[PDB]
């Protein structure tokens, strides 16, 4: 219930505000391309990241178990691997992950292993997508 986004602990009530801060910071000061250009992360890529989070959240949510089992933690480690792959492929995705603590959040969930920790992580990612849609637009 106490995520560790970056250097600031994230509780169960400031996920929306901190995700809004993350999106506004990226929107105000965006990533600079290698070839002297400006671009953001597309809605398709963040939607794919949310889908990845939705794959595991759809099975976690239909439970009352306090701690996630080994299969859920395996899927979370796999999602972290895919996060690393996306970061290594497109530098804008790496920038989006690094400006947030999406890797640090997934590592905190992996270390906590509790159901409520991943529930807060899903809330935070959902709010990131929400404030991308609100601020970035379409």
């Amino acid at each position: 219930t106490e995520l560790k986004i970056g250097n600031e602990k994230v509780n169960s009530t400031n996920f929306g505000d901190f995700a809004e801060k993350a999106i506004r910071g990226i929107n105000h000061k965006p990533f600079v391309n290698s070839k002297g250009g400006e671009q953001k992360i597309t809605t398709s890529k963040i939607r794919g990241i949310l889908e990845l989070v939705n794959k595991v959240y759809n099975r976690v949510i239909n439970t009352n178990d306090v701690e996630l089992s080994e299969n859920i933690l395996a899927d979370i480690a796999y999602i972290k691997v895919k996060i690393a792959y996306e970061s290594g492929r497109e530098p804008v995705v790496k920038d989006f992950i690094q400006r947030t603590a999406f890797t640090a959040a997934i590592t905190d969930v992996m270390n906590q292993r509790t159901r409520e920790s991943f529930l807060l992580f899903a809330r935070y990612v959902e709010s990131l997508i929400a404030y991308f849609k609100f601020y970035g637009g379409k």
Binding site: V53, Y57, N58, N62, N64
Partner: protein, 214 residues
């Protein structure tokens, strides 16, 4: 005297019964299925099963047509499902129950959960653009053990009551239960239909089984 109608409801296709209480995320599910709040186990509400069975049976028994109000159905439906009409109140001889799925251990043997996610969409015939949804659905092969209470009030027309009970069950078998049935979902089957005496013993209880199993 009172009788208990046991039996199992087996899903043939995915079955979705709506009702939503909390926390529908923006990329995960748009229509969850009704679940037992404590155990999180999906269930078939007795209201929905009773309503679908009553609709099918009332339509079948009347003329094949059914446009009336529930308190003006046929006398068999009125005496078996109840009637709230001012001067003519029929007390229901059936008490449906909420039906939780029973074979969760059997499902876990196959390394699956009891619910799936179904991805649908609608395509606007103008621009051919798709609008996706995400329906939670109880997987086919799920089994729901049920119990219906029959209040044995009239000792003689119990046989016709049970013939109509079996007829409604069979109407459900060639129809859907809950949710988007015409679009593939909702198919069910009935098995192990057995009536037993709640307390004591009933003279025609071996007859009531053979008019339920056949």
């Amino acid at each position: 005297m009172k009788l208990v109608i046991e039996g199992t409801i087996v899903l043939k296709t995915g079955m979705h019964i709506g009702g939503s209480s909390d926390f529908s995320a923006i990329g995960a599910v748009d229509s969850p299925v009704v679940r037992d709040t404590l155990t999180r186990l999906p269930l078939i509400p007795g209201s929905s099963l009773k309503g679908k069975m009553r609709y099918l049976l009332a339509k079948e028994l009347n003329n094949g047509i059914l446009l009336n109000e529930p308190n003006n159905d046929q006398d068999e439906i009125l005496r078996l499902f109840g009637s709230s009409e001012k001067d003519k109140i029929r007390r229901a001889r059936l008490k449906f129950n909420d039906i939780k799925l029973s074979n969760l251990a059997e499902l876990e043997t196959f390394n699956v959960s009891s619910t799936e996610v179904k991805f649908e969409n609608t395509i606007n015939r103008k621009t051919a653009v798709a609008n996706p949804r995400q329906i939670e659905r109880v997987i086919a092969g799920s089994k729901f053990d049920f119990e219906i209470f029959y209040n044995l009030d009239d000792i003689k027309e119990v046989e016709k009551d049970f013939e109509n009970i079996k007829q409604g069950f069979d109407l459900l078998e060639f129809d859907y239960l809950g949710g988007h049935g015409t679009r593939g979902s909702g198919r069910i089957a009935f098995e192990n239909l057995s009536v037993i005496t709640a307390v004591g013993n009933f003279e025609k209880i071996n007859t009531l089984n053979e008019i339920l199993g056949a």
